[model samples]
Structures are given as structure tokens and as C-alpha cells.
Target: MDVLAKFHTTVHRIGRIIIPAGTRKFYGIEQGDFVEIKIVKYEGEEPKEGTFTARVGEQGSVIIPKALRDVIGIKPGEVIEVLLLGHYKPRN
Candidate 1:
């Protein structure tokens, strides 16, 4: 099965995570785009499910808030899956 514009990356110490250029371009993600994040796998447990919104930054990155991180049990250096909602027609 072909995957959509999804990417996997580790969280940053400052709460920012970078989204690869290819993935961003593929999903038409803009700097201020709102991305949906989820915890696909963590600590090898039952893979808890959680969803939160993040704003894409200028450097193609998003800062996962501390509260959301705590709820999802995602700490710095932890891995997570990001799924961009869909194609963007651009806002005028």
C-alpha cells in the first residue's frame, strides 16, 4: 500500500520537530500549516492513540506543546508519526 504524506521523526528538546522537505512538499504543507500528530509507537507498549494539532514553522518544523507531549507520553528524542491532513489549495 502506498503511504500518504506521512513522516516519522524524533521530538526535539525545545519541542520542535522537523518535517522533511519531500514530505512537506508532497502534502503541500506551508509554514503556517496545521498538522495532525499522533503517537504511533512508544516504549513498545500497546501503542497508545492520541491526536494534536501543531503549527508548521518557517524551517518546516512544528513545536509540540509540553501539555500534549505529556498526554501522549512523548519526551524529547522520542519518535512519533506525523500525518499531514491533505492537499492545500492555499488561503487568499
Candidate 2:
């Protein structure tokens, strides 16, 4: 899949990124859709190299898995740029 959207977002206190509904639709995503989460840039720290997989929540939120967070060296309260890539079929 190619990059579909690029945006800067901060992790929630509870550890999730709230993807806007419009953006989700643009990618033809539904509940439980999987997205390729790529860290494009970091605001206050060194950027991690690698892509992460995120499952779309009902409200279009994607929780950064704790394991991936640790691997990517990120945490809540930090801001980062991201690229959302999609190609797989939407959830039925």
C-alpha cells in the first residue's frame, strides 16, 4: 500500500491516536480495519525506523501497541508525524 494520509498527532493520555472519521473514510476503512502506521517525524525526540500495524477501533482510533511503542521509543505526551497507508479490504 502507498501512503494515503499524512498528519501530525499526539498520543492520547490513554495511548491512542484518534484518526478523524473523514480520513478513515478516505482510506475506505471500517471498524477493525488494519492500517500501516509509519512514523514520519518526531517533534522532540529521535524518530524511530519501522512501520507499525494498528487495528482501527470503532471510533476510528488506533492504539499504539505497547510493544511497538517500546520498539519505536515513543510514549504519550509526545508529538509525531505519521503516514497512514491502506490497501486491504475493509472490515465486513
Candidate 3:
């Protein structure tokens, strides 16, 4: 078994520093897939400061912003798959 990590996104900014253009080509993220923005902390970075950032927004919604839309292809009524690989806790 192989663990293929984050997709190689080739996105570029207006001035410089691009994440590469071959993003959608490599990953299965098409024009309507929702993704979660995960923030991490170490011995240096504070923990509580990084919290309150777990907000799940629709892929096509304005909240998610124009961050990874062009790369993820989030559009109209297209459905996506979200696998929660946790301890399987039910929401209250």
C-alpha cells in the first residue's frame, strides 16, 4: 500500500511564486470537491491560537473563497466524497 499525499498543485500568483499548473491533472479534485484547510502547531507555535479555524465551507460557496477553487474545480451541482478517517464519533 502507498500513501499518496497532497496533490502537486502548480498554481502561480500574479507577480511570482506559483504552486504549479498541473494541479487538477494529478489529483482527482475536479470542478466540485470540498477540501478542509488544516492548520498545525509545534513546540513553538501556540495551540489555542490556531484553534477556531476548523470551518467547513461549501466548495462553491464564497466563504471558502477563491483559494483552491480553480485548482479543485468546485462548481455547480457536482457532488464529492469526504472520508472522515477518525475514531467515528457522532455529532451531538
Superior by lDDT: candidate 1 or candidate 3: 1
Tell me the number of clashing residue pairs for each predicted model. 0, 0, 9
State the displacement of the C-alpha of residue 83, model 3, in Å, after optimal TM-score superposition: 2.0
* Deviating ranges (above 4 Å) for candidate 2: 43-45, 90-92
What lDDT does candidate 1 reach at residue 37? 56
Q: In candidate 1, how many clashes are counted?
A: 0
In candidate 1, stretches whose alpha carbon ends up further than 4 angstroms from where it belongs are 1-4, 86-92
List the lowest-lDDT window of 10 residues for candidate 1. Answer: 82-91
Q: CA lDDT of 91 in candidate 3?
A: 43
Per-residue lDDT over 1-92 for candidate 1, one digit per residue giving the tens place of the 0 to 100 score: 23357778888887688888888787777876666655455556556445566777787877766777666677777777766543333468
What stretches of model 3 exceed 4 Å from their correct place? 1-53, 56-65, 85-92
Reference-based TM-score, model 1: 0.72
CA error at residue 13 for candidate 1, angstroms: 1.3
Model 3 agreement with the true structure over 1-92: per-residue lDDT tens digits: 12222332122232111112353244333334433332122222432111111222233221323443344544433332222111111246
Model 2 per-residue lDDT tens digits across residues 1-92: 56788777777765688877777777878876677777744434565744778777788888776666777667677777778755455544
- Scored by lDDT, the top model is 2
Q: Give RMSD to native, each candidate.
A: 3.0, 2.9, 12.7
